[PDB]
Design a protein around this ligand. Structure first.
Ligand SMILES: CC[C@H]1ON(C(=O)OC(C)C)[C@H]2CN(CCC(C)C)C(=O)[C@H](CCSC)N2C1=O
Length: 80
């Protein structure tokens, strides 16, 4: 039919995390850069709009990853 899976978990952070490794299994350079950008966020050097800017330049050939991440974010307009 179609490649779709509805119903995510409370913490889908680990899901997309490993997905990048499976997608770019033959391209370690792309995955390495992904980790570097994550480090900047871990150091609080960049914010939400900041990390997005980097992703938009790294995964320029894969907009799906950046777009899907918008919904793959637990923290949002939810009650909390
Ligand atoms: C969802 C899996 C995975 O995807 N992440 C990610 O950056 O995807 C983009 C590169 C497309 C990383 C980076 N961010 C960004 C935060 C910003 C405030 C939007 C995340 O929130 C946490 C990492 C920090 S919390 C552990 N994270 C994930 O959970």
């Amino acid at each position: 039919g179609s490649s779709g899976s509805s119903g995510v978990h409370v913490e889908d952070a680990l899901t997309y995390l490993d997905q990048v490794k499976i997608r770019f299994g033959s391209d370690p350079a792309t995955y390495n850069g992904f980790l570097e950008i994550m480090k900047e966020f871990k150091s609080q050097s960049i914010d939400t709009p900041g990390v997005i800017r980097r992703v938009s330049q790294l995964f320029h050939e894969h907009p799906d990853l950046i777009v899907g991440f918008n919904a793959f974010l637990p923290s949002g307009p939810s009650s909390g």
